[PDB]
Amino acid sequence: GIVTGENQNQTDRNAFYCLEYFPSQMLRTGNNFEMAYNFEKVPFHSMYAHSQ
Amino acid sequence: WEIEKERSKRWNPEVQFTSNYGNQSSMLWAPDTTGKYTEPRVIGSRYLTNHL
Amino acid sequence: DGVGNASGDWHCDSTWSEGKVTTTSTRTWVLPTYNNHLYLRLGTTSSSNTYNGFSTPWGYFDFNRFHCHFSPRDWQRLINNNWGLRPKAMRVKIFNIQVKEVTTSNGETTVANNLTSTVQIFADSSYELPYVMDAGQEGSLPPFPNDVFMVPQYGYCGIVTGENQNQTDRNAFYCLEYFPSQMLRTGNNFEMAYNFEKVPFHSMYAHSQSLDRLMNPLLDQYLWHLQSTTSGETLNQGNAATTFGKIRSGDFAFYRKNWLPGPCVKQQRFSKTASQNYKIPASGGNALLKYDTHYTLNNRWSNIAPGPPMATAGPSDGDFSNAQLIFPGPSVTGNTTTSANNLLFTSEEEIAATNPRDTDMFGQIADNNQNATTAPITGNVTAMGVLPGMVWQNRDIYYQGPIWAKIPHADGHFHPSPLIGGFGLKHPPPQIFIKNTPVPANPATTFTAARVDSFITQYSTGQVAVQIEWEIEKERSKRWNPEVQFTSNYGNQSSMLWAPDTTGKYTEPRVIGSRYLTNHL
Amino acid sequence: DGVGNASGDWHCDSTWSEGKVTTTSTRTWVLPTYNNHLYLRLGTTSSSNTYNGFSTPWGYFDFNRFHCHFSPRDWQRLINNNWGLRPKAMRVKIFNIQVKEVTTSNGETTVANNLTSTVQIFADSSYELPYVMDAGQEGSLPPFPNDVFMVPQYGYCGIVTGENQNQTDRNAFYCLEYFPSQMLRTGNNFEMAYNFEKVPFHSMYAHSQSLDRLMNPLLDQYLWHLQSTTSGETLNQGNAATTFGKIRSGDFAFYRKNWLPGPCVKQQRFSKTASQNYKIPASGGNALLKYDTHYTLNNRWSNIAPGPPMATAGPSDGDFSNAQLIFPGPSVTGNTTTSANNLLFTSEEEIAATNPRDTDMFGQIADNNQNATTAPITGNVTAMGVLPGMVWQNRDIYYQGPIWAKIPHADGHFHPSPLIGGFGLKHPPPQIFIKNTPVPANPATTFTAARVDSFITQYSTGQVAVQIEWEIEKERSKRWNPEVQFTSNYGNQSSMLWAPDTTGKYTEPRVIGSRYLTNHL
Amino acid sequence: GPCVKQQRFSKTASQNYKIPASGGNALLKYDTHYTLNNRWSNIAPGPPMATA
Amino acid sequence: SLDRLMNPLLDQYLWHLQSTTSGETLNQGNAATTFGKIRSGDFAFYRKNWLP
Amino acid sequence: GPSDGDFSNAQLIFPGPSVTGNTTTSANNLLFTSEEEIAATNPRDTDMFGQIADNNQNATTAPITGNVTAMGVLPGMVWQNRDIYYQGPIWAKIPHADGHFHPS
Amino acid sequence: ADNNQNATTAPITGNVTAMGVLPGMVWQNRDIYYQGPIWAKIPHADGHFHPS
Ligand SMILES: Nc1ncnc2c1ncn2[C@H]1C[C@H](O)[C@@H](COP(=O)(O)O)O1
Ligand SMILES: Nc1ncnc2c1ncn2[C@H]1C[C@H](O)[C@@H](COP(=O)(O)O)O1
């Protein structure tokens, strides 16, 4: 998290995120989890060296 | 829960509940180095002003 | 519609929705007769202050500041609960025109209402004139709705060649009377509408993460780096064996990072305590303008302020630079002060996460290539343009600061955001010009071709109404602990702040920006 | 509609029906320019008089008194024939606006009509402002239709912390120019309507029965009580034998009763003859404020007056308390008088049936538990809250008294009736604010950002019309003998009462409440 | 709930204090009574309160 | 504040007893009842519609 | 106020972060509820409701006024309820009974 | 509690013989009896409290 200056001490700008505050899925030995994702259009990595 | 948005014509800024704790060796309202979670201060619900 | 029918009503309230906020505000204005109805060129030859241009009989409405449209509470609702703001649309109405004539008799000015006199107003939509409304100057609607303000005069600077006043053939003269307008009498009213072009939300929030810390503190990198070229803690002594090592948690300065901090232009640092500063004259051979950072444009020095967005000291800190906007305080009087306590200092330090500090360098870059004989040398970097994969955050808007600016028409731009603050636009809200149509005095009975220089002394007054639909974004974060808010902590006061005092005077006690809510990178 | 077309007509008559009465009344008003168009905060540090707040350029219409809407005869028709009254609906119209300018020349003020000047009026329906119209203060429409009145200034007190002037951050500032209004010229007129919320009929009648007498005088109760603990008529002597007995007609104090008299707050009793009172300074260490009954709110004493409804002396009686409203008499002059004969005293003594007397205790309650050794002891009860099965009757309205009041927005109430009198409402008739839109004087030719402090001196005038539909209940009793009525018994008078005198002055000779007809519990 | 204290009388005649039936000092005076228009009236049974 | 619900500028049409004697000392004076109008600046003596 | 140098049973008391073991000799550890926002409509807990005239004076008898330590509700009385707290309870059950007054 | 104690002043507490109703107060009405009355007429008046 954000460090102000060279010192450890937190200020009021710092944030704490409790991962248990988010809805999840509880799985037993028969359950399974699945998700899908679609990358956003992004330029082709150009794999080649220039000959000029 | 059912709530009512404040609808006042007050001009100057109302009081708010903000974190003024300032520089802290450990963030308040968050676990400490030993994992213990405590509530640093008691805070009621009355901040916004209204008129009789 | 008539002499005895008011042409409009007083609208001045802000209505809130979850998606958007619409702020209407009305003021009363008074418009004199500038320059006795006649254009005047302007110019002065100064070393760096050299300018030339015209001053016009016309005057205009400047709506560009935030407190024109927002009451402090409405500004508190906004910045506390919302991540972003951009104007959707604008609307303006001018009505209740009242044209007065003044007659001095025995040293007594007696104002008498004049019905048939007109007033002529046009909004310039085609951007065919110099646009001065965004320059960050005075003349805006007052903050406080009861105050009544004086419409500013319109004049426009023009291209200066070198350090000399003299115009060349590239200069331009714009006659505002060459544009079609609308002539209004006491029954007529003027109205226009405008639609802002889509522009990115001003992000009102502070980052809760620093760039260099974007990693996971627990793990290590699979990357390796050179730890040292020799044993021992002293320089230029040891056994001179290259030691390669893994990048392990606890050494976070050596991590390989995907992004870089924002650009820099270093600024001079001045101390608010007068004893610490070095003695700099106001003007002369060696003057403060020279030692501040300034770009040289056609042999004319000009300060770079506020300059590119860079982290700044806190408002109460004992130093400041030209990177911090300065506003007058409540207790200030008469254009000059010897103590900084009166003044109210803008501070950017929330952007210290992604941006370098204004009074401190961007970094240090290796100057040479060492060998066993040559020791390494590293110079400071005072100025750094943008590089690929660089991130920065724009300067913050303020309750006193300007809303927008006009992107100068030019072949190229980079990241068009106004360095003072606000919203860069190609087609900003059009300036609205107004003047009192001249009424001649008693003419001679004979005929003469020379123009008539004697006029009835007049002025006009009336109302103006502004409506701007704003579009906002509610904060949607999972942060646990309480965020910072803008609250009134002023405490016990002999007189309420943000309200008139015993003498009726209204001032703004403190300068407050829009960044309170935290967010993460 | 035009300069030469009157915008409204003079309506001022009351029309009666068996179900309801509708009273219209019109007046002429004159509105100055308060505070030279600018807000001013107010405050003073006093031990118990400490206050803070603002004074505004605005002014408002106060319709809240009964004689605004009723002529004495119309008030006589009402209270003589009817048991109850409550307002059904209200309507208000402001018209015939005339805005004048005044110009002082050689010490001569010459008023000249100004057509294009405006006036701006808004009614606050959302109750977004401090509501001062019910506080029981001056500024109401005059009683007599010919008189023309001066619209009062609007200012509002605010929360006082402790005994000190100084505001804290809980205080609020309301800018009346932040609300949308309506700007009126000499042809425009303003109109609004209102619907009172259902509220219990004010019961205008006196009870013909006393609570303790609600029984049948002929019969006896089947209940038994302890008559005496000993023989003989002397205390602490006898044979000490408990004597139980039946409750038999002729002893009515020992009856078992289903109901209790109303609450009490004892008041101090002052005699109108100056020789009988004990000498009390006006202000000082020991002052009259201390010895009167007062609630201590945040270290600030405040009288309790009139206080809860309690029986009071007759108007002509030789004593009075703060429980009796006091009105100025016809012969009073100059804010002070040394003789009570001039003054006109409200009297509640009709409620002596159900309520205790203000200057006398609620009763006496047994202090201890006696035994053969210990004699019984009984203390007075000076203050008693409400208990189950308690009945009381509210304080009476008066022809000079207020019509309504606003129930303060709060978490809880009990029996919301205004202690002065009238109808407690959650949403009372909305205040109507009016001010003269400022007209600037001759401006400078140059530009300056500071606000313009020089204005044309103006005032306005016009008419106002009020209509309130009242709902009434005809008396429906089987009483045989003639009831009391409100009649004019004044007899031979050198000058008619309730009418102008030889000099044109109209005063109200006597204060008369609404309770004449008897009814039974 | 609310209270109005009452006097306590013992059924054994020897324990009570000797109170005449009517006179200067009478039982009506020493019982709890509300004064209505200068007329004393007992408060009985009075508000609901626990009893022996 | 409740006791401040009024308008600080105006006055009440009501009258009250200001003092029973002249002078600032208790139990001394000429013992003349002084009635007066309720005027702005004395806010403790206002007639108020509500109680704390 | 919470930081004031006095308190009563009218103020709820919550344990602080540094408190340990069911007992403490210093109030600084504890966190005190404070109602002082209701000082507008309500009397102070440690101070009287007011002072009520005890007798009826005459030329011989000086007036006497007693304090009021306890006052039930009267007609035309206004008050504001105690505030909820982030640690405080949400609800309560109105006891089943013949009568209530202002069930909060 | 009658007064506000300090190191010098000892606390003093008076009895409460009469107490009206307060917010959040509960009580139960007096019981009917086989010999007792069935009803009563609520006296016609401007106000009542808990008409039993
Ligand atoms: N103030 C301002 N005006 C106009 N254009 C700007 C401004 N700031 C940044 N930009 C440009 C530069 C970014 O690449 C892009 C983000 O647009 P996005 O909408 O986030 O996709 O817009
Ligand atoms: N003046 C005033 N305004 C508002 N509410 C009041 C007022 N006086 C008493 N009440 C409340 C208290 C009673 O229990 C009830 C009677 O309403 P009823 O209509 O008789 O059924 O209304």
Numbering used by the authors:
A (entry chain g): 370 to 421
B (entry chain k): 682 to 733
C (entry chain h), D (entry chain i): 213 to 733
E (entry chain j): 474 to 525
F (entry chain k): 422 to 473
G (entry chain k): 526 to 629
H (entry chain j): 578 to 629
Task: Copy text from the publication.
Adeno-associated viruses (AAV) are single-stranded DNA packaging viruses of the Parvoviridae and belong to the genus Dependoparvovirus. The virions of the AAVs are composed of non-enveloped capsids with T = 1 icosahedral symmetry and diameters of ≈260 Å. In this study, the structures of the AAV7, AAV11, AAV12, and AAV13 capsids were determined by cryo-EM in an effort to complete the panel of available structures for the defined AAV serotypes.
Surprisingly, the structural identity between AAV11 and AAV12 is 98%, which is only surpassed by AAV1 and AAV6 with 99% sequence and structural identity. In contrast, major structural variabilities (vs. AAV2) were seen in VR-I, VR-III, VR-IV, VR-V, VR-VI, VR-VII, and VR-IX for AAV11 and AAV12. Most notably is the 5 aa insertion in VR-V for both AAV11 and AAV12, relative to AAV2, but also to AAV7 and AAV13. In addition, both AAV serotypes possess a single aa insertion in VR-IV and display a different conformation to the other AAV serotypes with the apex of the loop positioned over part of VR-V. This subloop of VR-V and the alternative conformation of VR-IV are responsible for the broader appearance of the 3-fold protrusions of the AAV11 and AAV12 capsids. Overall, AAV11 and AAV12 vectors have been rarely used for gene delivery purposes; however, AAV11 was described to possess a tropism for the spleen and smooth muscle, whereas AAV12 was shown to transduce nasal epithelia efficiently. Similar to previous observations, a structural comparison of empty to the full capsids for the individual AAV serotypes showed them to be largely identical with overall Cα RMSDs ranging from ≈0.2 to 0.3 Å. This density extends into a pocket underneath the 3-fold symmetry axis and has been interpreted as deoxyadenosine monophosphate (dAMP), which is positioned between conserved prolines 421/632 and histidine 631 (AAV7 numbering).
